[PDB]
Design a protein around this ligand. Structure first.
Ligand code: CLA
Ligand code: CLA
Ligand code: CLA
Ligand code: CLA
Ligand SMILES: CC1=C(/C=C/C(C)=C/C=C/C(C)=C/C=C/C=C(C)/C=C/C=C(C)/C=C/C2=C(C)CCCC2(C)C)C(C)(C)CCC1
Ligand SMILES: CCCCCCCS[C@@H]1O[C@H](CO)[C@@H](O)[C@H](O)[C@H]1O
Lengths: 51, 121
């Protein structure tokens, strides 16, 4: 079968599932940005922009 | 000239009475008579809280806040003696009334600041 380092090559001839894999990557990255911001807001002290 | 039912739930019950723009006269003080304030009303429109900055140096400023306890803030039905002093100054000495309200306001960023808004004594 495909070696572990080639599993995503099933997408090369499959534009629809490539687009799906891209959408998922995009979902993960936007989800990261969202989560990262909320974690920063939950920990950020806005009381002193000077020091 | 409104009844309870005209007022109930409008927010008007937390507002002090007002006077028309024409009320720019003069109320005579007869040094011989005794006087009273039969009704004092105080209606806050702004609560400011002094910030506590990290180094004393730079004066700390009073900053605006958000009221979270609704239209429950006014002092009213307050009464007491209005003395005429030797020098013709008047001294109000509060005897009684609804002379305190607990109030919570909120600083930018969410910190809540409860206070007993009062003119007791
Ligand atoms: C847009 C960037 C991109 C894309 C879409 C691809 C896509 C592909 N690569 Mg290429 N590649 C890239 C960048 C990319 N690569 C980079 C930067 C390198 C050097 C690090 C390589 C080095 C490389 C090699 C040496 C090989 C590929 C292969 C492949 C194919 C199969 C991948 C697979 O099944 O992995 C399956 C992978 C796993 C099941 C697990 C990988 C776990 C990684 C190592 C650690 C955890 C990763 C973590 C989640 C990363 C977050 C990402 C972010 C920080 C960047 C596929 C066409 C293979 C190929 O040609 O097949 C014919 C192949 O042999 N790539
Ligand atoms: C952007 C990320 C991404 C996307 C869109 C895909 C998409 C695809 N993968 Mg690849 N893959 C990925 C990352 C991704 N993969 C990573 C990181 C690994 C190493 C674990 C793999 C290993 C892999 C294998 C072994 C296979 C695929 C296959 C496939 C296809 C079918 C779905 C599947 O079986 O997934 C399987 C992969 C996963 C379910 C990823 C596991 C999730 C990891 C462990 C993170 C856990 C998430 C969790 C919510 C957070 C943990 C938080 C922490 C604090 C504990 C599809 C093309 C299959 C296929 O088509 O092969 C021909 C297949 O057999 N993938
Ligand atoms: C006018 C025609 C048109 C338009 C507007 C686009 C636009 C786009 N294409 Mg391309 N593409 C086209 C023609 C078009 N394409 C044609 C004719 C082909 C050959 C079939 C391709 C083949 C192709 C592939 C293979 C891929 C793209 C991808 C992309 C997206 C990359 C950026 C992204 O994901 O941002 C982030 C997304 C957003 C910020 C959201 C945008 C809002 C969306 C568009 C509304 C969705 C509703 C709409 C009705 C669905 C149809 C959309 C479709 C026209 C793109 C972007 C939306 C990539 C992709 O989709 O990655 C996820 C991708 O893998 N295209
Ligand atoms: C320009 C920005 C950029 C680019 C080009 C990519 C490109 C890639 N991403 Mg995405 N990623 C990004 C930004 C980007 N990412 C951001 C901002 C996030 C949010 C953190 C992600 C989150 C993300 C996840 C969760 C996943 C990807 C995956 C992928 C790969 C999918 C294609 C593939 O099969 O490669 C095959 C893999 C490789 C060629 C190896 C890439 C190795 C990287 C460059 C170094 C990894 C370092 C080290 C070995 C891992 C140690 C981590 C450990 C200590 C936890 C590809 C290399 C998927 C992937 O790797 O699937 C296997 C995957 O699961 N990315
Ligand atoms: C479904 C749905 C929804 C929801 C959604 C959600 C809730 C989402 C979330 C999402 C998320 C929440 C996501 C997240 C993501 C994340 C990520 C993607 C991450 C990654 C990471 C990484 C990749 C890392 C790496 C590393 C490490 C770990 C160490 C150091 C080094 C490095 C950096 C490499 C709604 C309701 C809206 C509607 C529609 C439907
Ligand atoms: C999806 C995001 C919705 C969650 C929003 C949380 C309210 S917003 C949140 O409120 C706190 C106190 O008022 C502040 O300290 C903090 O800085 C602010 O980020």
């Amino acid at each position: 079968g495909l070696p572990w380092y080639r599993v995503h090559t099933v997408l090369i001839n499959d534009p629809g599932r490539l687009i799906a894999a891209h959408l998922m990557h995009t979902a993960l990255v936007a989800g990261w940005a969202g989560s990262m911001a909320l974690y920063e807001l939950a920990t950020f002290d806005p009381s002193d922009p000077v020091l | 000239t409104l009844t309870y039912d005209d007022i109930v739930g409008t927010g008007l019950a937390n507002k002090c009475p007002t006077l028309d723009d024409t009320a720019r006269g003069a109320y005579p003080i007869d040094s011989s008579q005794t006087y009273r304030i039969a009704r004092l009303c105080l209606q806050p429109t702004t609560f400011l809280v002094k910030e506590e900055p990290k180094n004393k140096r730079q004066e700390a400023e009073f900053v605006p806040t958000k009221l979270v306890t609704r239209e429950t803030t006014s002092l009213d039905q307050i009464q007491g003696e209005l003395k005429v002093n030797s020098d013709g100054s008047l001294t109000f000495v509060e005897e009684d009334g609804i002379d305190f309200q607990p109030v919570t306001v909120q600083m930018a960023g969410g910190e809540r600041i409860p206070l007993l808004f009062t003119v007791k004594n």
